[PDB]
Amino acid sequence: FYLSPPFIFRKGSTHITFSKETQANRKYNLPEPLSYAAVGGLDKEIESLKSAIEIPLHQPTLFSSFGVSPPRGILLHGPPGTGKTMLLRVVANTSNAHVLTINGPSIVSKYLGETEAALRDIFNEARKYQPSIIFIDQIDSIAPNRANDDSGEVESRVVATLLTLMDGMGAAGKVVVIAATNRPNSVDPALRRPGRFDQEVEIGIPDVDARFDILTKQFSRMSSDRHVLDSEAIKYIASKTHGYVGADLTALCRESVMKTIQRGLGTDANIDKFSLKVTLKDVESAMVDIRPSAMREIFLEMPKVYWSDIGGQEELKTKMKEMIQLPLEASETFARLGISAPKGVLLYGPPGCSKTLTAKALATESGINFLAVKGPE
Amino acid sequence: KLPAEFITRPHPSKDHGKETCTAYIHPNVLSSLEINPGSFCTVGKIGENGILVIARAGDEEVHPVNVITLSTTIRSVGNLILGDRLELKKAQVQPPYATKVTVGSLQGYNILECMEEKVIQKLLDDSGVIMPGMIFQNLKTKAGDESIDVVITDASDFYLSPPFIFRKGSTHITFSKETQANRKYNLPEPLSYAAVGGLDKEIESLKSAIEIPLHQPTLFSSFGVSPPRGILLHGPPGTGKTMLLRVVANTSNAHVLTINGPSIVSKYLGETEAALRDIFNEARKYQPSIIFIDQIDSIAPNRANDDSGEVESRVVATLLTLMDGMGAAGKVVVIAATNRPNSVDPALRRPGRFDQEVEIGIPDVDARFDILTKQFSRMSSDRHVLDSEAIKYIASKTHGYVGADLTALCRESVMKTIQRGLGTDANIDKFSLKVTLKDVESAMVDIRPSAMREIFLEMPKVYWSDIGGQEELKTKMKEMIQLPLEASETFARLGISAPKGVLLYGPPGCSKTLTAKALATESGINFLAVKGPEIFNKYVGESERAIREIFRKARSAAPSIIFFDQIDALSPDRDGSSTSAANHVLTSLLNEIDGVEELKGVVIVAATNRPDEIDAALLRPGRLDRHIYVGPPDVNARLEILKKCTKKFNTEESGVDLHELADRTEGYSGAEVVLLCQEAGLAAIMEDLDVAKVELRHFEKAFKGIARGITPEMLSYYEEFALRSG
Amino acid sequence: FYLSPPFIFRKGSTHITFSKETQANRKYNLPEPLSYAAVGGLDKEIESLKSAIEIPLHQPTLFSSFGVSPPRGILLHGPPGTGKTMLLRVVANTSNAHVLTINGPSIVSKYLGETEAALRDIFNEARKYQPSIIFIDQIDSIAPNRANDDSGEVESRVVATLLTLMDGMGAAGKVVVIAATNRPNSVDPALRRPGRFDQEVEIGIPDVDARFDILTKQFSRMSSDRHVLDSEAIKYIASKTHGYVGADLTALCRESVMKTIQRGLGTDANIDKFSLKVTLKDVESAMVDIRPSAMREIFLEMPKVYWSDIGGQEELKTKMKEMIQLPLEASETFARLGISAPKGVLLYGPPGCSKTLTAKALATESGINFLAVKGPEIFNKYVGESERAIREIFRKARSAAPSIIFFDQIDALSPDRDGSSTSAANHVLTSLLNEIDGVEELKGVVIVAATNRPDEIDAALLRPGRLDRHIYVGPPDVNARLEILKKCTKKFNTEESGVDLHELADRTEGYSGAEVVLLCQEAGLAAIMEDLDVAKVELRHFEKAFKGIARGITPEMLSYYEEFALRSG
Ligand SMILES: Nc1ncnc2c1ncn2[C@@H]1O[C@H](COP(=O)(O)OP(=O)(O)OP(=O)(O)O)[C@@H](O)[C@H]1O
Ligand SMILES: Nc1ncnc2c1ncn2[C@@H]1O[C@H](COP(=O)(O)OP(=O)(O)OP(=O)(O)O)[C@@H](O)[C@H]1O
Ligand SMILES: Nc1ncnc2c1ncn2[C@@H]1O[C@H](COP(=O)(O)OP(=O)(O)OP(=O)(O)O)[C@@H](O)[C@H]1O
Ligand SMILES: Nc1ncnc2c1ncn2[C@@H]1O[C@H](COP(=O)(O)OP(=O)(O)OP(=O)(O)O)[C@@H](O)[C@H]1O
Ligand SMILES: Nc1ncnc2c1ncn2[C@@H]1O[C@H](COP(=O)(O)OP(=O)(O)OP(=O)(O)O)[C@@H](O)[C@H]1O
Ligand SMILES: Nc1ncnc2c1ncn2[C@@H]1O[C@H](COP(=O)(O)OP(=O)(O)OP(=O)(O)O)[C@@H](O)[C@H]1O
């Protein structure tokens, strides 16, 4: 209890000693504030969001002189697990301004007027203190499209009161609202307006270099002595991860840690778990063990067959390998030549020769997410 | 007897240079607030740290306890307009004397009444404190039946504006001209008629329908007709209804009550009507009152649907009864604004109550130009360099940009200017930079119109130079798209509209979709892409709603281009084998294209692979007028495609002339040439890993590997259909 | 805070003089009495209602010994805004008797017994206090049909007790109750079953005649001076906007007054409005700008079109005019002579033959009101919403003379394709058949339908009451094509170009109006593009635009239409 215990100071009994450590001791498991360096691969979006939040919040004289109203709300949309919530958390921690944790549908209650009274109280509290930020998560559910036949009445009322609070007779004062959702289409079109939600950022799936940056940031956050790795090894791991996101990378790293712990336990009995180290083959094993988030909804498995299993002509193997692996293994040559992959093959011939076995071999030793669909399915 | 909120009313006595900066307060309130009559008392409009440091004691019980009388001159700094809520704060701090102050005339004239023989007795002989800035009526001070207004701007030596104590001998008055108050400290300002542009024909009607029922109710009623009481404003969201309501509230000398929010309803059964009754009684009792009800659709839902079951239905019933209860004796006007005109209950929309309905449409080129010019005039002159011609050109470029999108465009242009200055001038002051046309174009590229927000289309940018095919199709598309928009005066003079019909039929994969992508990239106009079977839905009638919504979005997003890719998917319903959904979708499409309501500006483009499967109803004139053969590319087109694809490759190093190869690929198509080039590049990649050129052997191998898909039978059928069409 | 300031009067200490007219000063804000003269036009309905209400309200001793069911109601109903409330007020004021009644917004009570005891006490007082007229407004709101599940709640016992209680004090005794409602078919059929509502007097919207009379009456009522009094102007404004109800007329008068006020202020810089006078310009501006509730709830209006803008086979126009004007102008000739008009025409033909344009012109000329309805539009996701929507659009929005319903594509409703049972299309077709087989003359609905593929129409829909009139709607002839070419070439300079506009029409023999318009548009666009603005068209432009037209009307569909017409007979 009491989180971290306190202590009593004395003039001559402390015996202050100086140590070289930025962070506090980890034995107290105290929360660590987030910094902008934690998020990687999104430099342009981070800079744009930071500017669009800081400028309206601080020194609004620039906008007052120009006669243009400062932006009011910012909407963040993208695939789940991309890092929008962590971005909101880090921008809340870094900015020294009032925040209001309107997490979700906690505003609506069984009472008829409570669902609007709570929002009015929140907006009044935000307006009372000039530096204030509003962080809305899953705005689609609380404020859905009114045109839909399933919208209802209380949802329409809450949408109307949100619209009135954001824009109306009572103009907002130097307050910014941040909304995060995974389905921007479900958001009411009235909310997505230049007067309310002009600033829209589409946080897409990270690409290869963004994934490498995220992995490097995670490894830098980890202690240097905990794991030994090279920059080329991290780049190779990032290249192997195709459909991975920040959540997928975190899950991969955690699974690698667990695999390292279990390998140490197996190799040495009653050994210290903190003395183990993470190697490249361990990360590869964790990667092959775990599954990407996008492939979770796909449920199909086949026995593992290798490239050596297919007995036949090598021309098909060479052509399909040059179609598949070349754009990913060496993309600089394609970029220089300005040519893309053909992206298409048709296998026509006598039944049972090489088609389904080739598909299985690709699904096994392709290193890429595989999707199988049937004709009449 | 301790009300939470205090309302305000103007002083009954006219301004005469005395009793200014005094707010009468009921003795009961002063005793409860332990504030003596002589002190500095601050009032604010629910927060915002509003300050007025004025305190006075009311006389007997004639002054209502809830209301506080505020002078017109002192009410200008707080922007309160006849009914703004007021909060009492007993804490105060004695301010020091002011050693510097300036006076600025509101009018364009400068240096007026320099002697100040009688002016000094007004703003200098008064014992009460004077804010750094307000608006003075000054009554009449200049000969020639003209009244001047003075607005003090600067004053030096938690609160919104620090009040300064003045004295006649404290310092010297530096009279000058600085228009309104300085912007070094934030200060609310009124919105005038010049703020709203492009709505003159509607603003005059609104002015009349506000002034006549308020200023002269009985004078108008003398003829024998009840004066109008309800005004309804409806239109697309973000058009300027809220600004119009704010302007008519600020410029009017009548009480205003804000009941736009759904806060009128309460959990208690009786309160949702008691609050409305109290508000209407307060509006009627004081006499000159204006009522604004935004989002009336949520407050008063339609009774036709099952959504408005009990509570909102009884709210509408009570509102209707209380609206019909009042007579023509009082001077009260009710203003209702909503995004959906059809969501209002038909009971409210009646000639006896809501006859005066004003529709606000999407601004045209002239209205957009007027709005842009007014916004630039409001913006500081030294902060902008664009002239009238640039503003007109920008307005012409903007098609579906409503005033909200125009304001967003201006803000984004300012942000782009700031970013460019920071990047180029190595952290120079942001205030020194000025907006230019390049920043405006960059902001236009960055910002999409609000009407296209619901449509997500991530498409690669392809220009007309990339398509090296036949120039006849490009010329026809340009003459159909850009020509009517560029010069509509000639079309109006000649009395001919736009054909707005394209039927792209030909070999698959040659050029139909590429023209759609090319048009979307290099048209500068809103582009809508609709797939063939993507509109079908499992439920009955949901495809109807989807197509109606798509057409409504296209209509509301200015003239635009609709690309119906593979229109033949849902067309053929010659018998009962096809489901009724396809026939209903086809009928709805025909009705939306021509039907009964004419389509102006929007262009329908259809690309198909089987023109015969399309029903003759869509083939009639007025739907898909223009027909393009768009066959296989010619020798020149194929040579251009080969040159474009090989431009990255080293032609001179290899020695290929790009002519023998072009002659060899006579029977191929547009996509087959690209596939052959890709195969040659892949072979060059495999031959030596890294390479910067392609040799003739790779081209020969690719040509051997290419399988022709343009069968002569398909070309014969297409040419037979073409000759049948004629 | 009084209706009028009180005073003190004496005999010899004050002077008494008599002058002015009957009407009192308007500065007192006092109301004015309402008489039967205050209402014009409806009067034909009023004559029937005053007679029927009056025989019971006056001497009802005639049916004393008869013992038949006593007449205690009229059941007034009609289109919304028809002015029933002013008729009720007039009949209440002129009766100079007790008018004890209450409407309420479907007034109920939370207590189980009080919600009925209130009505019982009201009826007991009415029996004791014997009011001449009792007003029951909005019967559908307070007592709708029992067919709907949610409609029968609460009101069932109320209406049952009302029915079983109103059958009292027979022979002698007036106790006449007036039932006024907006929806005629929403009333409970069991409520209409007894014979006291056998008359079912329904008041229609003013039209054709008496409109100028009521306009003059309302103008005189508002002010006998400072206004224009011209018979020709009033007749013209009555003829214009034939679909305007009396409430729309009052709104027009109010907007004309507003326009006069605005013009006077803008002209004389806020002068007193007593001397201002009303002119025709402000009336026309008000008529343009009112947008009354008659065309509301639609938000869309058909484009303007005139007979000069369209030139076509005179036979079709003559047949359509005979179909529309003859029953619409009057109905007593049809009723007395027994003529049964088909009240329905089917427009089938090749696409682009301007059947929809013909319907638009018909609505613009005679109807002066259009109600555009689309087949697939009435379809709804819910099973029961489509039937309710089609019933609403068929009944509530229908007006007797003004409104005509036009079907863009009627062939998309009847065919259910491979539908066995429980289908939305089958349900809507059955509802339409039920709501169309019970109408013969009614109010001159004269529905009009257009189609492109007649072969799907004959699916349980073609009935002898609707196939009486068939219009071939053939392609335009050489004269019609020449007229279309001349109309489209009017903006061009024929004299400067020298084109005779004859050989072009002769060459285009198999074309129609749509193809002619398209080729003229293409020629104009080419002329604009080639040399900017030239204000003329040459023969080369027509030659260039000739290849743009895709064939035309192919003979196979023409033969199919001909054989379908022969089969129909
Ligand atoms: N750029 C990143 N760098 C490091 N870790 C990341 C990054 N993006 C995501 N993660 C990890 O993935 C987790 C999921 O991200 P976050 O909690 O921000 O949710 P989100 O992407 O907004 O999605 P949801 O829709 O589920 O709220 C983070 O807590 C973090 O551990
Ligand atoms: N070259 C080969 N090497 C190894 N096994 C083979 C080979 N050719 C066929 N087989 C075996 O025969 C089976 C039949 O081949 P496969 O399942 O790929 O069928 P297919 O070509 O897709 O034909 P179909 O779907 O028309 O029946 C394989 O699953 C495998 O067990
Ligand atoms: N005529 C106009 N001139 C200049 N700016 C305009 C105009 N109309 C709208 N805007 C801009 O759009 C913003 C939104 O307009 P406004 O606040 O008046 O709401 P509204 O049009 O009534 O819409 P909503 O129903 O969404 O509240 C304004 O704050 C202003 O920046
Ligand atoms: N004339 C051309 N110029 C440039 N590229 C071309 C040309 N013709 C074909 N291509 C290339 O070939 C591809 C195939 O053409 P595309 O699929 O766009 O044609 P389409 O006829 O509209 O399509 P589909 O018939 O499949 O609906 C194009 O995307 C482009 O990359
Ligand atoms: N004979 C008449 N002469 C003049 N005006 C008339 C006449 N009959 C009706 N009116 C007009 O009709 C209106 C009377 O409206 P009323 O209060 O009766 O409601 P309503 O709209 O007819 O009701 P509901 O829709 O419930 O039947 C007034 O505008 C009045 O001028
Ligand atoms: N006599 C004519 N005068 C003027 N224009 C005409 C004439 N005949 C045809 N047209 C033109 O051709 C068009 C054909 O009519 P419309 O487009 O309404 O289709 P429709 O013949 O009713 O066919 P569909 O069954 O496809 O609706 C008219 O709208 C008009 O532009």
Residue numbers in the entry:
A (entry chain C): 209 to 585
B (entry chain B): 29 to 185, 209 to 777
C (entry chain A): 209 to 777
What did the published study say regarding this structure?
Next, we prepared a mutant form of Drg1 with two mutations (E346Q and E617Q) located in Walker B motif of the D1 and D2 domains, respectively. Mutant Drg1 hexamers were incubated with excessive ATP for stable hexamer formation before cryo-EM sample preparation. The cryo-EM structure of mutant Drg1 hexamers was determined at a much-improved resolution of 3.5 Å. Similar as in the structural study of Rix722, the introduction of the Walker B double mutation allowed the capture of an endogenous peptide within the central channel of Drg1 hexamer during purification. In the structure of the mutant Drg1 hexamer (Drg1E346Q/E617Q-ATP), a polypeptide was found in the central channel, which passes through the central pores of Drg1 hexamers formed by the PLs of the D1 and D2 rings. The six protomers of Drg1 form a spiral staircase to accommodate the peptide. Thus, P6 of the mutant Drg1 hexamer should be the “seam” subunit reported in the structures of Cdc48/p97 and Rix7 in substrate-engaged states. Specifically, while the polypeptide is held by PL-Is from four protomers (P2–P5) at the D1 layer, it is clamped by PL-Is from five protomers (P1–P5) at the D2 layer.
The type II AAA + ATPase Drg1 is a ribosome assembly factor, functioning to release Rlp24 from the pre-60S particle just exported from nucleus, and its activity in can be inhibited by a drug molecule diazaborine.
